[PDB]
Design a protein around this nucleic acid. Structure first.
Ligand SMILES: COC(=O)C[C@](O)(CCCC(C)(C)O)C(=O)O[C@@H]1C(OC)=C[C@]23CCCN2CCc2cc4c(cc2[C@H]13)OCO4
Ligand SMILES: [Cl-]
Ligand SMILES: [Cl-]
Ligand SMILES: [Cl-]
Ligand SMILES: [Cl-]
Ligand SMILES: [Cl-]
Ligand SMILES: [Cl-]
Ligand SMILES: [K+]
Ligand SMILES: [Mg+2]
Ligand SMILES: [Mg+2]
Ligand SMILES: [Mg+2]
Ligand SMILES: [Mg+2]
Ligand SMILES: [Mg+2]
Ligand SMILES: [Mg+2]
Ligand SMILES: [Mg+2]
Ligand SMILES: [Mg+2]
Ligand SMILES: [Mg+2]
Ligand SMILES: [Mg+2]
Ligand SMILES: [Mg+2]
Ligand SMILES: [Mg+2]
Ligand SMILES: [Mg+2]
Ligand SMILES: [Mg+2]
Ligand SMILES: [Mg+2]
Ligand SMILES: [Mg+2]
Ligand SMILES: [Mg+2]
Ligand SMILES: [Mg+2]
Ligand SMILES: [Mg+2]
Ligand SMILES: [Mg+2]
Ligand SMILES: [Mg+2]
Ligand SMILES: [Mg+2]
Ligand SMILES: [Mg+2]
Ligand code: NA
Ligand code: NA
Ligand code: NA
Ligand code: NA
Ligand code: NA
Ligand code: NA
Ligand code: NA
Ligand code: NA
Ligand code: NA
Ligand code: NA
Ligand code: NA
Ligand code: NA
Ligand code: NA
Ligand code: NA
Ligand code: NA
Ligand code: NA
Ligand code: NA
Ligand code: NA
Ligand code: NA
Ligand code: NA
Ligand code: NA
Ligand SMILES: [Sr+2]
Ligand SMILES: [Sr+2]
Ligand SMILES: [Sr+2]
Ligand SMILES: [Sr+2]
Ligand SMILES: [Sr+2]
Ligand SMILES: [Sr+2]
Ligand SMILES: [Sr+2]
Ligand SMILES: [Sr+2]
Ligand SMILES: [Sr+2]
Ligand SMILES: [Sr+2]
Ligand SMILES: [Sr+2]
Ligand SMILES: [Sr+2]
Ligand SMILES: [Sr+2]
Ligand SMILES: [Sr+2]
Ligand SMILES: [Sr+2]
Ligand SMILES: [Sr+2]
Ligand SMILES: [Sr+2]
Ligand SMILES: [Sr+2]
Ligand SMILES: [Sr+2]
Ligand SMILES: [Sr+2]
Ligand SMILES: [Sr+2]
Ligand SMILES: [Sr+2]
Ligand SMILES: [Sr+2]
Ligand SMILES: [Sr+2]
Lengths: 160, 186, 92, 95, 154
RNA sequence: UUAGGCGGCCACAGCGGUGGGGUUGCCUCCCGUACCCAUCCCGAACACGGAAGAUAAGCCCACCAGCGUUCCAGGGAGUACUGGAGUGCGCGAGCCUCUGGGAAAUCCGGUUCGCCGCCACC
RNA sequence: GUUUGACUGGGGCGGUACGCGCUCGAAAAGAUAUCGAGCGCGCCCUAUGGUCAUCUCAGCCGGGGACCCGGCGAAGAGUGCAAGAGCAAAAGAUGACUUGACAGUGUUCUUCCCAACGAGGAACGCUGACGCGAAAGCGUGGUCUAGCGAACCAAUUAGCCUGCUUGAUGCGGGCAAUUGAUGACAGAAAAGCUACCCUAGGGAUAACAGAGUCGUCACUCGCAAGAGCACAUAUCGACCGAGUGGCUUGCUACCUCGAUGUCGGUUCCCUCCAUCCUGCCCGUGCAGAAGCGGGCAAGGGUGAGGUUGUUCGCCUAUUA
RNA sequence: UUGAGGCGCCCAAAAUGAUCGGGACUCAAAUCCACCACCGAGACCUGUCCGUACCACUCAUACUGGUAAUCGAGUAGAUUGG
RNA sequence: ACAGCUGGUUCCAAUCGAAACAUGUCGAAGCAUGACCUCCGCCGAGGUAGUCUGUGAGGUAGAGCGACCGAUUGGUCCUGUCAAACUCCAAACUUACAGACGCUGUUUGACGCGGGGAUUCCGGUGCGCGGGGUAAGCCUGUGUACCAGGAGGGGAACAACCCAGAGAUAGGUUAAGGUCCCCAAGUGUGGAUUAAGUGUAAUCCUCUGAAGGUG
């Protein structure tokens, strides 16, 4: 199904699992990547992926953008490299689909999406100075797999 | 105490001094309350009405101000209790109070007890208080005949301070006589 | 539900509280001499009889209590408002 | 509404804030009001008896007598005049 | 004391806003009223802010406007110095204009219509779709700004 | 109020903590069961009778802020949201300007370890 | 001779949003719809009702998942049943007593916001008689909001009124009220077929077509994992993301029901490009030949046949 | 070397004849920031008249005088004079 | 014959001027009772469409959750997220009553009461807030203004977008919008950008243009 059906915040917040049954599991395998034993303050460089438009990003898009981002970091910095990436948004919004015409139209549960407001950090990676251009490329691949245009903003790093 | 949602009881409930449920049922009558309170050594009797910023006492009587009329005897007993009620009731009649309802507070409604004696005294003074005759003590126990027949089992004296030996409940009679007389300074 | 056969309650006849006996209202037999019985005979001819061609309707899932409260001293009965009870059994 | 009972949509107004929980103080339950007095109508969640229909929460009526211990308070619902039977526990004096 | 002028018509205007204008004695477009600066009156102009033009006028401008557009409570009659002398508590238009600005009296209290029925703006106004800060003619004006408007509506 | 009783508001009063206070006075703990009364068993409690002892409890007085709570300052924030208006911007979801209102979290610093009423009383 | 209901993104089938209660939807007063989301009621209880006395619960800790002692413990226990709400010297628990789950008659609110409408319901009074308690007081059933039913007729309860000139007897008529059901729940006693059909109307409403939409369908683009002996990008290409079209399908019910003739085919004309051939090009896993992929390009061409009504499709021989 | 902003470019395929209403326009006849002067309703201001309402006078609802910034659009429908 | 269904129902003018909603209905193409419109009589001094202040009611937006509740990360306290049916908090705002100002009423009698007559119970659209639906010139709410039943001016045309609410006639000045021609008014002024005919398109079924890319 296209994202055109779910990308906008046009419906109420539908998260309450005590009233909703049959919710498909999240396709997101990991949320804490790289070296999850080390601290975020132990790194000199902190670069985040900032979403420019207020959207709803599905669990399938989150997994696709996370996979294409972390796979590049595993390719360039190694499987046990000196970095740590975080996906801070979780898919709370439960999604429906009306799949009888418009009669009894309340749709059955088909998926989950993450409500991300404009200006928010979806991804945040902490790396060293020499690995900074490899992570900007991981985010360049990650923004092509989500709905809005994005900013790759450097938060802690006057090393240029 | 634990957090924002914690419910701390009302102050007089926290202190375990006022039974708020009994208080409402008491205040429903519209009549002033005959507050009958006790202590180990003394007995109190107040005529309380309802006020805007708190309760208003119109006429009180403690068993300590009983000696002012000629009571050389102890203050935490049955004869003392009646006389403290009679003294409160008479001061009430001079204040314009005609009727009342008995408030015993956290004390027990035990038949023949001191709080019912405080009530019998206040009724005898001229106050109209809703009562029950068979819940009150027999006239002789109110006199202190139970204390005199306890002094009959002597060997060792009951009272330490010198008042008398075999005890005089005739002092009760000599006190009710003084209070029933209208010439008295209240 | 359970109901006491004998109990103290108000008597509207004696104007005071007395011990009443509870009994279920037994259906009194029909005479067949009332106006409606005479109308059934008169208004019935060839074809449909209108109201007299109708057959008795259904039942409610639970009926109300149909009781008689008989006074112990004066011996007179009174009726009360019934309440929905699936079964009504008496105690003693 | 899904149902048209008296306590429909009254989760908010007939519930207390956790600190205002428990039995209410007797002083306001025995308060005496005179005829002509303007009184605010608000149900005390802790007091079960002597309540009015929740639709009238927030009204400022005029005491026009009493029925037993409860009061007869005159209000104007929209354009219609109504007389409400209400105890002091659910009333507060204006000003 | 502020000078209110209606610049936007009644059609599609909220009823509670149209009713406020009618309470402020202003029933037609280009009609002006002299409103005192009180708490009650401040709430009223704030409600009408988007369909009006207001501000404190100068003694000079108010005098010009009263001379040309003031009318009695009933009738055609010119409100000149001689009229003001014979019917008001003042000597000339200046004495009336001063009292109004200092909030000592009102036009009605002095036997005049509360409405100053102005002429359309000569050379036109700055527009009825934008406020003063955006280059339009709606809302609060400067004393120099309201004067230009009232003088153009002689 | 050199310790009491009845209260109003019902945490600004809660939780926790330190120090001080009682010869015929007060409140207590305390001492004791012939009685009124009492325990589905216990004078523990309730009830009654009483002063050998005590200030250790409670209670009353003075005080501490670590937790909870109330209010205030400054910061967050005139931000978030928002009533009225617009031939303002945006493909659009949406945003912006003008006008009238205006948070919450949190951080720092203050406040708060009850206030008030009636009565009685060296 | 009649009946065979209504609701409904046309109708039927399904369902009941056909009488009721709760939360949310509902936009912080009130009111508020959809075949809106979550889910209930058509009872049950003589105590599971009423009062009074005594008392404090979940859970956890410590000492001897039954029991016992102590401590912490405002409430997470319990309170018949949905949900939301109320309750701690109680509205909960235990114990004892008790029958107010009483008769009669009202006021008011609700039902039905505003704003008329019945039955039903609730709150709050009075009169009578009672229960409990020392008493104030509490008890008009269950802590609150669901558990309900007209007229006619019958049965039943207590007293009384009345039946044609009159008295007696029988048997009737009535005033007040209880019980018996109509769930299509403000109450008819009630099954279907019609392509043999008929009438009134409707584009208030379906089938074809138009129109809107674009999930579906077709086509494209971004990113490029992957494989392609090594090599992402000769070639193939997942996930995900962004779109264009208006050929498929679906949705809607705007237009036409006083009719805009339904599929397929044929014949004749015009057009579109997302190009199958033909012209000119770029790349190649381009030796050549034959290909694969891509670009410009709509001038012209794109044919004959076997099954099938077929569109579609399968098949044959020809063909640039 | 890197950051930000403005306008534009690529992405961008449809059926009888292309389009911003057309012509056409390029230091504009575009866009953005300011500014100047004008054109332009039945609105607003103004002369006269009409109706309606009300006021004064009146038997009058006949004249006459006065007031309306706060009267003058209207389907179904109610009312009234001709 | 009956029909709750379609069609038609003939002269002029003046005043006021709807409802397309609620309750019940074998009711949904119909009625009744309310709402609302109009007319008459009564009453006789207040009224309340706006604002301000005071005394009250409220849990939506937002926010937050070692504040309940239930969702929802990882590490050896720290670290990562949420809620239509959560709330330690909390607006704007809506709302009861009262006072004040405003407006209105006491010959135009308001507020209110009683009575006669209706029409109406297919609505639509814009905007704000919604709920369903991929969406819709979709379906279904709500507040409001409008079309319906609203002329005239502008928008190429075009019910509801902008100006504007309108007796006749006449002069004048503006509004929206516009001033190169068609076409009334500028080939106006100061300055800058754009080379694509971008653009010369407020709103929109109607005016597209996206992610991505651009020495
Ligand atoms: C169900 O199909 C029909 O009933 C065909 C016909 O009966 C043909 C009528 C021909 C006449 C008699 C009018 O000459 C008819 O009235 O058609 C309508 C009709 O008759 C005028 C025309 C309609 C109306 C919309 C356009 N469409 C074209 C023809 C048609 C074809 C259909 C159709 C409807 C229409 C209607 O159902 C699917 O096939
Ligand atoms: Cl005591
Ligand atoms: Cl029975
Ligand atoms: Cl009520
Ligand atoms: Cl005429
Ligand atoms: Cl108008
Ligand atoms: Cl061109
Ligand atoms: K047709
Ligand atoms: Mg709510
Ligand atoms: Mg005038
Ligand atoms: Mg001009
Ligand atoms: Mg202009
Ligand atoms: Mg000490
Ligand atoms: Mg736009
Ligand atoms: Mg049907
Ligand atoms: Mg509401
Ligand atoms: Mg019948
Ligand atoms: Mg029967
Ligand atoms: Mg019905
Ligand atoms: Mg009904
Ligand atoms: Mg036919
Ligand atoms: Mg149609
Ligand atoms: Mg034809
Ligand atoms: Mg091509
Ligand atoms: Mg060709
Ligand atoms: Mg006519
Ligand atoms: Mg006329
Ligand atoms: Mg929110
Ligand atoms: Mg119409
Ligand atoms: Mg010209
Ligand atoms: Mg163009
Ligand atoms: Na179906
Ligand atoms: Na006959
Ligand atoms: Na309370
Ligand atoms: Na001590
Ligand atoms: Na039927
Ligand atoms: Na009723
Ligand atoms: Na289609
Ligand atoms: Na498309
Ligand atoms: Na054909
Ligand atoms: Na070609
Ligand atoms: Na073939
Ligand atoms: Na008309
Ligand atoms: Na018929
Ligand atoms: Na109907
Ligand atoms: Na019909
Ligand atoms: Na006034
Ligand atoms: Na919002
Ligand atoms: Na309708
Ligand atoms: Na209109
Ligand atoms: Na036009
Ligand atoms: Na062009
Ligand atoms: Sr939506
Ligand atoms: Sr993107
Ligand atoms: Sr016969
Ligand atoms: Sr027969
Ligand atoms: Sr049945
Ligand atoms: Sr002892
Ligand atoms: Sr557009
Ligand atoms: Sr788009
Ligand atoms: Sr401010
Ligand atoms: Sr269908
Ligand atoms: Sr009850
Ligand atoms: Sr059948
Ligand atoms: Sr056949
Ligand atoms: Sr082409
Ligand atoms: Sr070719
Ligand atoms: Sr076909
Ligand atoms: Sr086939
Ligand atoms: Sr006219
Ligand atoms: Sr007219
Ligand atoms: Sr609201
Ligand atoms: Sr020029
Ligand atoms: Sr220029
Ligand atoms: Sr079109
Ligand atoms: Sr772009």
């Amino acid at each position: 199904k296209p994202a055109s059906m779910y990308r906008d915040i046009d419906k109420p917040a539908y998260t309450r699992r005590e009233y909703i049954t049959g919710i498909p599991g999240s396709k997101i395998a990991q949320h804490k990547m790289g070296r999850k034993q080390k601290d975020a303050d132990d790194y000199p460089v902190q670069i985040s992926l900032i979403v420019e438009e207020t959207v709803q990003l599905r669990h399938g898009s989150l997994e696709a953008s996370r996979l294409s981002a972390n796979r590049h970091l595993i390719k360039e910095l190694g499987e046990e490299g000196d970095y740590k990436m975080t996906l801070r948004k979780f898919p709370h919004q439960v999604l429906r689909e009306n799949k009888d015409g418009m009669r009894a139209a309340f749709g059955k549960i088909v998926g989950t999406a993450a409500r991300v407001q404009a200006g928010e950090q979806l991804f945040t990676a902490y790396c060293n100075v020499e690995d900074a251009e490899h992570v900007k490329e991981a985010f360049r691949r990650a923004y092509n797999k989500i709905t809005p245009s994005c900013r790759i903003k450097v938060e802690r790093g006057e090393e240029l | 105490a634990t957090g924002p949602r914690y419910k701390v009881p009302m102050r007089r409930r926290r202190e375990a001094r006022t039974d708020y449920h009994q208080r409402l049922r008491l205040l429903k009558s519209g009549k002033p309350r005959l507050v009958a309170r006790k202590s180990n050594k003394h007995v109190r009797a107040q005529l309380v009405t309802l006020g805007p910023n708190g309760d208003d006492t119109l006429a009180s009587a403690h068993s300590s101000d009983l000696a002012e009329y000629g009571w050389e005897a102890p203050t935490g007993n049955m004869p003392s209790a009646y006389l403290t009620g009679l003294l409160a009731g008479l001061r009430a009649q001079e204040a314009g109070v005609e009727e009342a309802v008995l408030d015993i507070g956290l004390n027990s409604p035990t038949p023949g007890s001191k709080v019912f004696a405080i009530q019998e005294g206040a009724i005898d003074a001229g106050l109209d208080i809703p009562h029950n005759d068979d819940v009150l003590a027999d006239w002789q126990r109110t006199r202190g005949a139970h204390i005199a027949e306890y002094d009959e089992q002597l060997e060792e004296p009951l009272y330490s301070g010198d008042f008398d030996a075999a005890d005089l409940p005739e002092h009760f009679d000599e006190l009710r006589e003084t209070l029933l007389d209208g010439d008295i300074e209240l | 539900m359970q109901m006491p056969r004998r109990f103290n309650t108000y008597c509207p006849h004696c104007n005071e509280h007395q011990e009443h006996e509870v009994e279920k209202v037994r259906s009194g037999r029909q005479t067949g001499m009332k106006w409606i019985d005479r109308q059934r005979e008169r208004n019935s001819g060839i074809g449909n009889d209108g109201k007299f061609s109708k057959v008795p309707g259904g039942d409610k899932p639970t009926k109300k209590t149909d009781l008689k409260y008989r006074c112990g001293e004066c011996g007179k009965a009174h009726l009360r408002e019934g309440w929905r009870a699936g079964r009504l059994e008496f105690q003693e | 509404p899904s149902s048209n009972g008296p306590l429909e949509g009254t989760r908010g107004k007939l519930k207390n804030k956790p600190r205002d929980r428990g039995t209410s103080p007797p002083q306001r339950a025995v308060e005496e009001f005179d005829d002509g007095e303007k009184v605010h109508l608000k149900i005390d969640p802790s007091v079960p008896n002597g309540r009015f229909h929740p639709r009238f929460d927030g009204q400022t009526g005029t005491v026009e007598g009493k029925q037993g211990d409860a009061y007869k308070v005159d209000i104007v619902d929209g354009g219609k005049e109504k007389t409400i039977i209400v105890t002091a526990a659910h009333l507060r004096r204006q000003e | 004391m502020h000078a209110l002028v209606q610049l936007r018509g009644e059609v599609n205007m909220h009823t509670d806003i149209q009713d406020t204008l009618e309470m402020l004695n202003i029933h037609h477009v280009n009609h002006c009223t002299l409103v005192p600066e009180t708490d009650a009156y401040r709430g009223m102009v704030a409600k009408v802010n988007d369909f009006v033009a207001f501000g404190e006028p100068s003694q000079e401008t108010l005098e010009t406007v009263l001379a040309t557009r003031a009318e009695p409570l009933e009738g055609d009659a010119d409100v000149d110095d001689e009229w003001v002398a014979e019917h008001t508590d003042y000597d000339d238009i200046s004495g009336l204009a001063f009292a109004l600005l200092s909030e000592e009296t009102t036009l009605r209290e002095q036997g005049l219509s509360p409405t100053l029925r102005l002429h359309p703006p000569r050379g036109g106004h700055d527009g009825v779709k934008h406020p003063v800060k955006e280059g339009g003619q709606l809302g609060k004006h400067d004393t120099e700004g309201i004067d230009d408007l009232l003088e153009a509506m002689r």
